[PDB]
Design an enzyme around this catalytic site. Sequence first.
Site, mmCIF file in Angstrom:
data_model
loop_
_atom_site.group_PDB
_atom_site.id
_atom_site.type_symbol
_atom_site.label_atom_id
_atom_site.label_comp_id
_atom_site.label_asym_id
_atom_site.label_seq_id
_atom_site.Cartn_x
_atom_site.Cartn_y
_atom_site.Cartn_z
ATOM 1 C CG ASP A 76 52.233 39.059 42.856
ATOM 2 O OD1 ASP A 76 51.649 37.952 42.692
ATOM 3 O OD2 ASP A 76 52.868 39.332 43.893
ATOM 4 N NE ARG A 110 50.420 37.240 46.586
ATOM 5 C CZ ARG A 110 50.087 36.157 45.886
ATOM 6 N NH1 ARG A 110 49.247 35.259 46.392
ATOM 7 N NH2 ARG A 110 50.606 35.967 44.697
ATOM 8 C CG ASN A 111 49.367 42.034 45.619
ATOM 9 O OD1 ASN A 111 49.833 42.647 46.589
ATOM 10 N ND2 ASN A 111 50.071 41.129 44.921
ATOM 11 C CG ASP A 144 50.952 46.464 46.983
ATOM 12 O OD1 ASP A 144 49.881 46.815 47.531
ATOM 13 O OD2 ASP A 144 52.035 46.396 47.609
HETATM 14 C C1 LIG Z 1 47.994 44.741 50.213
HETATM 15 C C2 LIG Z 1 49.401 44.767 50.787
HETATM 16 C C3 LIG Z 1 50.483 44.456 49.960
HETATM 17 C C4 LIG Z 1 51.773 44.478 50.485
HETATM 18 N N1 LIG Z 1 51.984 44.779 51.761
HETATM 19 C C5 LIG Z 1 50.996 45.067 52.595
HETATM 20 C C6 LIG Z 1 49.663 45.090 52.145
HETATM 21 C C7 LIG Z 1 48.558 45.402 53.099
HETATM 22 C C8 LIG Z 1 48.180 44.441 54.036
HETATM 23 C C9 LIG Z 1 47.151 44.671 54.925
HETATM 24 C C10 LIG Z 1 46.476 45.865 54.909
HETATM 25 C C11 LIG Z 1 46.815 46.863 53.983
HETATM 26 C C12 LIG Z 1 46.132 48.113 53.924
HETATM 27 N N2 LIG Z 1 45.087 48.358 54.788
HETATM 28 C C13 LIG Z 1 46.560 49.036 52.945
HETATM 29 C C14 LIG Z 1 45.934 50.347 52.730
HETATM 30 N N3 LIG Z 1 46.269 51.052 51.629
HETATM 31 O O1 LIG Z 1 45.083 50.775 53.487
HETATM 32 N N4 LIG Z 1 47.572 48.714 52.127
HETATM 33 N N5 LIG Z 1 48.187 47.593 52.180
HETATM 34 C C15 LIG Z 1 47.873 46.637 53.067
#
Ligand SMILES: Cc1ccncc1-c1cccc2c(N)c(C(N)=O)nnc12
Length: 270
Positions: A133, A137-138, A151
């Site tokens: 995926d 966004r990832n 992710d």
């Molecule tokens: C990338 C993602 C995928 C799934 N759910 C949430 C996120 C996410 C959204 C916003 C910010 C973050 C973040 N700052 C960190 C992080 N590791 O700092 N991780 N995930 C985030």
Amino acid sequence: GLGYGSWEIDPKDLTFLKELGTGQFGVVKYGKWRGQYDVAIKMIKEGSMSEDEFIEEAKVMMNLSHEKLVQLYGVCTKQRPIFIITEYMANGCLLNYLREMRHRFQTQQLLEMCKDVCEAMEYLESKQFLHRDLAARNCLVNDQGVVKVSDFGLSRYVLDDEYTSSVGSKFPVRWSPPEVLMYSKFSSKSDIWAFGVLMWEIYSLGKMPYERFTNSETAEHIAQGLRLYRPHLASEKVYTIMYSCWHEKADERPTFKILLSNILDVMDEE
Ligand SMILES: Cc1ccncc1-c1cccc2c(N)c(C(N)=O)nnc12
């Protein structure tokens, strides 16, 4: 500690500091581990994830480490509101970061973001591990502006069928090659296709791919062989690299190793 494997983190070692954001498994918070070490804490939403399956896979994920790949630190399991503990990325998700016009990015910075992701992806590909995926966004941005892939592989554990059915209302149609949409044929070359769409997202400063089309219309467009076109900020050479990811025949798409070479070439030329 006594009741813990090497993949397991004692939740009592966590200090929660603030909310970082949200997504398909719910909220992600910033915390300290043992008072000192910055962590992200994915507080996996009840009923969102195939948790026993994920937990087993986490053991494999602990051994994936690369500078451009968000590090998994461990998992808090003794509690079916489970936690996934990862590297903290202060600047948050790439999609939101691209959309903030204040940054006033040079195309050199945008190309570096592509290279960051490509390096992580080449690594994953060398381990025969599909992201499944890949999209802005990832991807995450750290306090130094470095982009890292996050992710990876987690879509395999999503219980919501809206996300996993190719016709599901939440499936990543816009990042999917024809063979995925048509027959659910996932491979390294589906990761390649998504990386191309990811390059487009970066050079488009976070515009939605096929922004004027519904999912259903996008799927039809793609199946007919039509494509995204060149973002204004991409040079001809950068456009050529992203477009190569979208060959109708999967086996004519490059590897991440070749794409990395191509990106480095452009960096030396531009
Ligand atoms: C990338 C993602 C995928 C799934 N759910 C949430 C996120 C996410 C959204 C916003 C910010 C973050 C973040 N700052 C960190 C992080 N590791 O700092 N991780 N995930 C985030």
